[PDB]
Symmetry: D2
Subunit: 122 residues, 4 copies
């Protein structure tokens, strides 16, 4: 599925996820968010199951973006956890956690949760 | 917080998180889980905010493990999203998502959520 | 939105959510899951913001089902947290946590997370 | 566990959860938050597994609060999902989702996630 995963993906918000899957299970690339306090590309890294089950289960993967680049620093980081589902309309189905740096007093509201679905087209 | 983050951490379950924080915002290391379908070390990668706010906010970070190594494949991946809090008893406070690859019929129950707190001692 | 909310809703799995919104902010009804260790109807209760913002924001709400009725006991409970969005195709957009009763040794994997979208038609 | 659950609990933030567990699996009571845009008591309702497993598993439960009372309206709702653990130091261990009413353009950041642990003392 390294072939399957490698490439450019778009989520329902119009964000762009550019990724390369290595044969060793690495994920590397860039992320551009259509929303939030964000501009241009941000480095991402992650991991995926490079020897998935052959029973038509999806392929588990996840990755992280820290929302700091040369343009902006949102003092936050998102991780997406999900699975790649192959076939005619390939999808990465995710849930994500966004944590922003807070004081201890604000720690209770430090983390957003959502869900993003990525496809190969817009 | 490069120095602050780099090192060996343990969570409340007795899992071991060995990480290096690069100056470019990279996290690299290994993870050993005291629980689940897991043995020995697994590669992790992630990102952290390499220029955090100076108002006493934590430092946002996240990382991923795909639960495949030379011993086992759990066909799953966990992402931790959280913040590093410096000082006498330093902490990484996280929330995590564990997605396991499923059929589309089992997709609704593909994801676990939890929270791990990491300290520099057991 | 009392009127808007009250009635029969269906999610993307084919589950059926039958609810009455009281004027005091109460939600009462039954839930039938198309998936999992579930048969027939289960009691639900919840709350909703009975005086929402008038700026086009959704209406916050949540509810709980404990997965025990006269047929089955899954020893678990789901809460849905989300918002009701009015207009031509009304939606309830949710995220949910499902916790199942565990031993302390299995507590780390006690909780599932997902997202359900409910509409007035199947 | 009806007697077990019924009563006053406190979480790690100093919030106060006052609950009655009915024989039919109902949870009714009030919640006061030590944090956020909250004052005084708010109605809660929820459900719990009134016939738990006898193998030393916890008891599943959940409840909702809509953050509207006679003082304030935060246009939001939290659901807690978790389990009651009996014994010398009884605990309710939860994860929670807080959704606030948003426009469709801000839906992606409408939901916070956390974890609260409740005990019988502060
Ligand atoms: Na509820």
């Amino acid at each position: 599925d390294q072939a399957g995963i490698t490439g450019t993906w778009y989520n329902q918000l119009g964000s762009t996820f550019i990724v390369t899957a290595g044969a060793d299970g690495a994920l590397t690339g860039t992320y551009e968010s259509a929303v939030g306090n964000a501009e241009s590309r941000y480095v991402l890294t992650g991991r995926y199951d490079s020897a998935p089950a052959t029973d038509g289960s999806g392929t588990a993967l996840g990755w992280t973006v820290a929302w700091k680049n040369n343009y902006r620093n949102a003092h936050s980081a998102t991780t997406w956890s999900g699975q790649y589902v192959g076939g005619a309309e390939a999808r990465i189905n995710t849930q994500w956690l966004l944590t922003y740096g807070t004081t201890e007093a604000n720690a209770w509201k430090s983390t957003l949760v959502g869900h993003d679905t990525f496809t190969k087209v817009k």
